[PDB]
Amino acid sequence: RKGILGTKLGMTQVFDENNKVVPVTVVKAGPNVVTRIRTTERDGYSAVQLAYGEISPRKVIKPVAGQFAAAGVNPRRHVAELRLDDEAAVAEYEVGQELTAEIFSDGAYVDVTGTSKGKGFAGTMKRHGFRGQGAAHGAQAVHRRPGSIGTPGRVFKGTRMSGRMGNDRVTTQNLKVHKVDAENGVLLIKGAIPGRNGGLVVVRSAIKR
Amino acid sequence: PTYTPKAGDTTRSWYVIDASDVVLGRLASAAATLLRGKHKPTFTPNVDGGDFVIVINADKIAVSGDKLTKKFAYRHSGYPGGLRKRTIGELLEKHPTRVVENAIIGMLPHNKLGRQIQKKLKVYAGPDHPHAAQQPIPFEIKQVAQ
Amino acid sequence: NAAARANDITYNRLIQGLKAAGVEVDRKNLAELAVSDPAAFTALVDVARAALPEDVNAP
Amino acid sequence: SRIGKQPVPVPSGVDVTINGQNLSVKGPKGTLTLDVAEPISVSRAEDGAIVVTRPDDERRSRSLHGLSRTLIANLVTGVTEGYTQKMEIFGVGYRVQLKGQNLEFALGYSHPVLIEAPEGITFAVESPTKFSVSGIDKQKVGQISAVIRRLRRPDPYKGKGVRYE
RNA sequence: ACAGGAUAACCGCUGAAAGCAUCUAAGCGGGAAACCUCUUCCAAGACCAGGCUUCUCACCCUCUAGGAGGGAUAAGGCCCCC
RNA sequence: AUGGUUUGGCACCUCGAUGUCGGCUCGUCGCAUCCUGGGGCUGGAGCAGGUCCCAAGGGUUGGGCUGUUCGCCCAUUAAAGCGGCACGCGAGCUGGGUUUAGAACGUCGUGAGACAGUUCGGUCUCUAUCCGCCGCGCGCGUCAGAAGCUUGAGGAAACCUGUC
RNA sequence: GGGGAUAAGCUCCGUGCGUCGAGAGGGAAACAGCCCAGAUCGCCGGCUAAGGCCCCUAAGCGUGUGCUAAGUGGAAAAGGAUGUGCAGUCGCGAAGACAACACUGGUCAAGUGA
Numbered sequence: 001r002k003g004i005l006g007t008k009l010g011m012t013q014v015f016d017e018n019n020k021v022v023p024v025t026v027v028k029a030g031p032n033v034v035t036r037i038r039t040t041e042r043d044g045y046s047a048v049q050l051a052y053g054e055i056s057p058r059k060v061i062k063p064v065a066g067q068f069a070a071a072g073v074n075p076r077r078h079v080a081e082l083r084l085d086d087e088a089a090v091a092e093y094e095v096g097q098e099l100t101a102e103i104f105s106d107g108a109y110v111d112v113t114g115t116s117k118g119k120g121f122a123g124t125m126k127r128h129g130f131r132g133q134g135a136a137h138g139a140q141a142v143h144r145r146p147g148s149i150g151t152p153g154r155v156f157k158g159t160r161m162s163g164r165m166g167n168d169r170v171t172t173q174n175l176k177v178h179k180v181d182a183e184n185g186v187l188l189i190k191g192a193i194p195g196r197n198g199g200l201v202v203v204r205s206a207i208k209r
Numbered sequence: 210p211t212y213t214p215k216a217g218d219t220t221r222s223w224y225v226i227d228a229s230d231v232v233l234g235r236l237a238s239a240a241a242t243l244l245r246g247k248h249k250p251t252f253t254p255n256v257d258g259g260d261f262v263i264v265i266n267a268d269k270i271a272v273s274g275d276k277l278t279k280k281f282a283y284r285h286s287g288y289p290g291g292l293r294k295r296t297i298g299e300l301l302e303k304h305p306t307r308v309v310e311n312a313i314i315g316m317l318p319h320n321k322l323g324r325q326i327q328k329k330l331k332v333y334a335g336p337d338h339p340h341a342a343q344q345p346i347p348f349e350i351k352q353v354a355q
Numbered sequence: 356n357a358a359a360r361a362n363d364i365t366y367n368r369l370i371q372g373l374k375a376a377g378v379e380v381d382r383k384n385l386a387e388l389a390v391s392d393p394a395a396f397t398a399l400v401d402v403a404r405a406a407l408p409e410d411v412n413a414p
Numbered sequence: 415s416r417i418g419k420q421p422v423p424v425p426s427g428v429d430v431t432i433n434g435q436n437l438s439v440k441g442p443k444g445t446l447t448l449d450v451a452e453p454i455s456v457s458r459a460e461d462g463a464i465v466v467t468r469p470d471d472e473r474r475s476r477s478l479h480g481l482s483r484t485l486i487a488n489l490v491t492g493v494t495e496g497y498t499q500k501m502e503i504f505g506v507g508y509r510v511q512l513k514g515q516n517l518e519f520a521l522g523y524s525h526p527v528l529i530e531a532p533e534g535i536t537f538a539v540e541s542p543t544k545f546s547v548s549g550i551d552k553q554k555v556g557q558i559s560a561v562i563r564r565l566r567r568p569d570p571y572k573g574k575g576v577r578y579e
Numbered sequence: 580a581c582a583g584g585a586u587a588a589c590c591g592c593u594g595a596a597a598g599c600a601u602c603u604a605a606g607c608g609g610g611a612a613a614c615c616u617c618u619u620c621c622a623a624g625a626c627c628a629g630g631c632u633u634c635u636c637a638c639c640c641u642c643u644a645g646g647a648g649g650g651a652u653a654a655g656g657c658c659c660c661c
Numbered sequence: 662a663u664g665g666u667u668u669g670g671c672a673c674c675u676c677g678a679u680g681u682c683g684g685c686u687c688g689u690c691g692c693a694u695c696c697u698g699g700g701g702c703u704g705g706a707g708c709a710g711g712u713c714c715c716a717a718g719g720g721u722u723g724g725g726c727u728g729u730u731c732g733c734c735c736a737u738u739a740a741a742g743c744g745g746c747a748c749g750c751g752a753g754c755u756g757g758g759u760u761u762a763g764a765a766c767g768u769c770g771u772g773a774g775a776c777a778g779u780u781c782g783g784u785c786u787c788u789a790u791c792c793g794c795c796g797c798g799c800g801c802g803u804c805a806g807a808a809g810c811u812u813g814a815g816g817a818a819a820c821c822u823g824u825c
Numbered sequence: 826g827g828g829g830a831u832a833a834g835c836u837c838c839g840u841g842c843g844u845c846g847a848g849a850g851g852g853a854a855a856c857a858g859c860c861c862a863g864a865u866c867g868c869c870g871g872c873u874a875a876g877g878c879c880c881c882u883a884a885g886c887g888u889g890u891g892c893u894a895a896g897u898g899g900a901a902a903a904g905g906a907u908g909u910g911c912a913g914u915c916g917c918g919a920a921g922a923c924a925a926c927a928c929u930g931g932u933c934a935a936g937u938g939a
Contacts, residue, residue: 035810036631036632036810038631038810038811038812042631043630043631043811043812044630044631044812045811045812045813047810047811047812049810049811061634061654061655061807061808061809062633062634062635062654062655062807062808063632063633063634063635063654063655063807063808063809064633064634064808064809065633065634066632066633066634066808067632067633067634067808067809067810068633069633070632070633079809079810080810081810081811083811121796121797124687124795127795130686130687131685131686131687132686133685133686133753133754133755134685134754134755137685137755138754138755138756139685139754139755140754140755140785141754142685142686142753142754142755145686145753145754146686146687146753147685147686147687147750147753147754148685148686148687148688148749148750148753148754149687149688149750149753149793149794150687150688150689150746150749150750151746151747151749152793153792153793154792154793154794155793155794155795156288156289156688156689156793156794157287157288157289157793157794157795158288158289158794158795158817159687159688159793159794159795160687160688160795161794161795161796162795162796163795163796163797164795164796164797165796168620168621169619169620170619170620171618171619171620173580173618173619207617207618208580208581208618209580210869211383211386211387211869212386212387212390212391232886234879234880234886235879235886237879237880238879238880238886239879239880239886241880241881242879242880245880245881247357247880248357248360248361249357250357250358250361250389250390250393251390252357274894274896275894275896276896279896280896284815286815286816286817287816288816288817289688289689289690290689290690291816291817293816295615299585299615303615304814313880315880315881316879316880316881317880317881318880318881318882319881323881324626327627328626328627331627350886352886353360353363353364353365354887355364355365355367355368355411355885355887355888356883356884365884365885365887366883366884366885367878367884367885367887368885368887379871381870381871382870382871383869383870410888411887411888412887412888412889413888415595415596415597416596416597416598417595417598418595418596449606451605451606473596473604473908473909474604474605476595476596477595477596477604477605478595478596478604478605479595479596480594480595480596480597480598481594481595481596481604481605481606482595482605483595484593484594484595485593485594485595485605485606488593488594551593552592552593553592553593553606553607553608554592554593554607554608555592555593556591556592556593557591557592557593557607557608557609558592559592560590560591560592560608560609561591561592561608561609563591564590564591564609571705571706572706
């Protein structure tokens, strides 16, 4: 399973060779530098840690700067881990190695992971798709409230009631990569990927396809 | 009046119990008695003057009957339909130590003092333990003949 | 009971042996002996052992 | 019970090793290993045989005694000459042949049917209609024979499919 | 979803008690949207309060020198601000 | 023989108050399974059924008439399951029915009036203390103070299906 | 004993019957009416009742002889059923019994049937 860190730029329109339209989301799969190797003999699990983003050296605090110096690379803004399956899979990464966009190929299926947009304090109508009550025929101030809550006289756990919504990590599966522009380090992914423009995303080879 | 332990009176010793081919209930009761401090003449229900207990070869333990595949360990998450059950077989092959831990914990009091006593029980599926530094005394389950 | 099992005898057999031996010390002072002076308790255990029948399960 | 009391003869040319209850036998056809139940011990009788000695007469042991005897007999006869199962087809258009180590049939399904040959068995096909499998262990041979038998639902009407001799 | 594991009804293999037989009491296999994994998410207040690292890694005063109390700092954080 | 899902019987519980039917909104559980899944014998040729075991993961439509549940019907569908939970749910909603006072018809009564007969109309109150539940913080703890990246015991979500 | 469907935690009578009412204490997990036992007060003394003695929980992972494989113990019927222990019978049988290869003959080798 390959992987890379990127940034959501926006969505646009392209046409394939059958003249059909493809709505594509542009992701800046920028250069990532491998900072640490997680090994079973040391950490108990095999994983690779990638750094992304450009940040001023005067902005990083001392612990982070020390970690990056121990790695041997200049600091970056964002750090994340890719969990592999076994040592044979992680043997192909070594610290300081640079990953760019061309690890993916045209037509590949990818898994983009991002943080959903925030929606604030949301009612059950919006948070859970509850059907409302009547807007007329005598309904009294119940046009949007959940209604019943339903022996022990107890509201069971998991009640789908109102609350804060959004701002959760979301994975969209089996997205097709329409084009891999190597010059700009840009992936053209058919479909809509989570989060707002300028947010961090993780692009991974699909686990299913 | 009756003797009462003071601040510095309690002394602890470490026993290591080999659970290979030992009846689960028997070992659980012996370890519970050891943890409670019932074997000491200075015993007092108020104080946890027990001893630290190490149990090795937890996976080799003996279960009679057909309880290996017919006795269930239950737990409820609290959500509706959150009841999960595992027989002693899969519990043993997945978390070997949990069977002995549950058995021993069920046989000692359910107060806060029981919670403090639980801290003095260490069980391990392997034939060895990392507590060699304390020099535990090997302990064998005998019966006082009357 | 704890102190008697420390001397390889059960509490009930110890009490029966003490009764047969005729010693008239009660449980309060028996516990006092067990906690304070283990030597006296061991001696009492021996005298109770002597006072017991040879086959306790005999009719 | 009755069968168990009779020691099973051991041919001279086949090596028998006894390690408590773990019994291993090296024969001309190959080697097979058997584990005996704990209420019964087996000792190789010096006269070229093994002794199935049951020391108790409670239901478990008395039932296990003859079973252990016949299991040992099966093991020795399977390591000495092996075991052979003969098979065939009835009907028309049903073709069977061996493709290397793996067996391919065309029973009439829209897809070709393949069977994987496990260890210890081998497939013989001297005719498309009739063929055979042979091995050193009777249990495995029977299991694979039944598996290949399963390739068609039973036909009480025409009897088209496969049946033993 | 795919794939794996243990199974239900069921189909079986190898066979005793019960000289034969018996999918069975010893065993070994197949077998479902159910079960365990697998997918997504939360999760160390998981009191057994985890792990891999990286940074600071030092200066006073008081009571009585047993411990405590107070002050000033580092890495860092918060408040104020946009 | 089971069950307390149907009418019952008792009057143990409340008259210094335990909302009475349907409907809406939102559930949760059982399996005595409607579809989908695995089976077996067929008085099963194939198709398709009949009947029966396992199986509760998901799903189980929109309208006409009636206050209705029930029920009949109209179109579909893979299917249009049966039940428990104060015959779930009015400090969540409705007030069409029932169940005050107005009025009329039929019948009973000399009459005032009456009818588990009908007909039209007819106030549904409350700022959430505690438990519960959905979210969000503050404090302290995790044996010096901090900061990155994480393992996961343990939980939650999802699980449908047709035509060609 | 009657009424009711010999159903009710139904209802109505009899009882030198009991308990609660008006009764604590111990036991039955909790438990007015069941079992033990009637509290004058104090004791950091002893023996017992019912009930109990692996751990929770005081006292026995007591001793001896047998039984149970069902977690029976630790809920229930009509009925069904090559489970097993004991005892009692009968049928057949070394003239070779049963099985195996309706009733008869040969191999075989002790028990075989209800």
